[PDB]
């Protein structure tokens, strides 16, 4: 039953206290379970207040590179992404996330193949936002956030995406990337845009990764290639138009 305990109220205070490494991790793990297992009204109490405090820490940890910092920091970022997954698992949580300046950007920055499990979780959240039949064709805004991430981390906006798809990485990471690639392309009605994204990825060597990935007997990889190739086939005839 309910009892006096860490409410959303206490987690907000705790996150804003300036915790780091293992006690931060412990707070976040506890918070993720709490967000996932409590009613949406508990998430509402947490909503603007807790989300801001998660992002405050997340942004800092993205700039604080774990190779030159704490071994826990990589896991701390990842656990924030898991907290966000539980937070965005609803109505008003999705809403509050789209009302943040950097929430979308930080989810893209969390797509790092060096911490492969975090990229899997982050790419999934972005993909879920991309396919939304709501707001604004949110997939189109997610692309902007990668363009921002491109200059902030000095990379090509789609370089980390391809880098999941990696013979020599886990299948879930590989695909975590193909999935978001499909999520960016498919919801857009503009044909020239769909082929532009597809061609942009092909410049980055994507064409070479697909041939490696089609040899894999996987579940979801097969599902994602099949979609990518099918939309590619339609788009080719769509561009051709009449003859």
């Amino acid at each position: 039953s309910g009892s006096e305990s860490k409410s959303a109220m206490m987690y907000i205070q705790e996150l804003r206290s300036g915790l780091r490494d293992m006690p931060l991790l412990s707070c976040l793990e506890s918070l993720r379970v709490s967000l996932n297992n409590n009613p949406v009204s508990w998430v509402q109490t947490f909503g603007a207040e807790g989300l801001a405090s998660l992002l405050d820490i997340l942004k800092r940890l993205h700039d604080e590179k774990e190779e030159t910092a704490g071994s826990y920091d990589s896991r701390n970022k990842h656990e924030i992404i898991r907290c966000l997954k539980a937070f965005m698992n609803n109505k008003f949580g999705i809403k509050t996330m789209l009302e943040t300046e950097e929430g979308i950007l930080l989810l893209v920055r969390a797509m790092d193949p060096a911490v492969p499990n975090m990229m899997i979780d982050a790419a999934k959240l972005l993909s879920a936002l991309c396919i939304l039949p709501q707001p604004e064709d949110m997939n189109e805004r997610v692309l902007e956030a990668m363009t921002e991430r491109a200059e902030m981390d000095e990379v090509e906006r789609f370089q980390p995406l391809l880098d999941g798809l990696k013979s020599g990485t886990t299948i879930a990471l590989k695909v975590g990337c193909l999935q978001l690639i499909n999520a960016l392309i498919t919801p857009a009605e503009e044909l020239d845009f769909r082929v532009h994204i597809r061609s942009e990825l092909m410049r980055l060597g994507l064409h070479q990764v697909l041939q490696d990935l089609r040899e894999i007997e996987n579940e979801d990889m097969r599902v994602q290639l099949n979609v990518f190739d099918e939309q590619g086939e339609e788009d080719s005839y769509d561009l051709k138009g009449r003859l």
Binding site: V40, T186, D220
Partner: peptide, 29 residues
């Protein structure tokens, strides 16, 4: 308490059911 909303989107992505979105513009007539 539709706390599951993102979970359903993950299903839709994995099955590829969501990549079945096109309002359908065309110029060929």
């Amino acid at each position: 308490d539709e706390t599951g909303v993102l979970d359903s989107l993950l299903e839709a992505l994995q099955s590829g059911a969501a990549f079945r979105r096109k309002r359908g513009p065309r110029q060929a007539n």
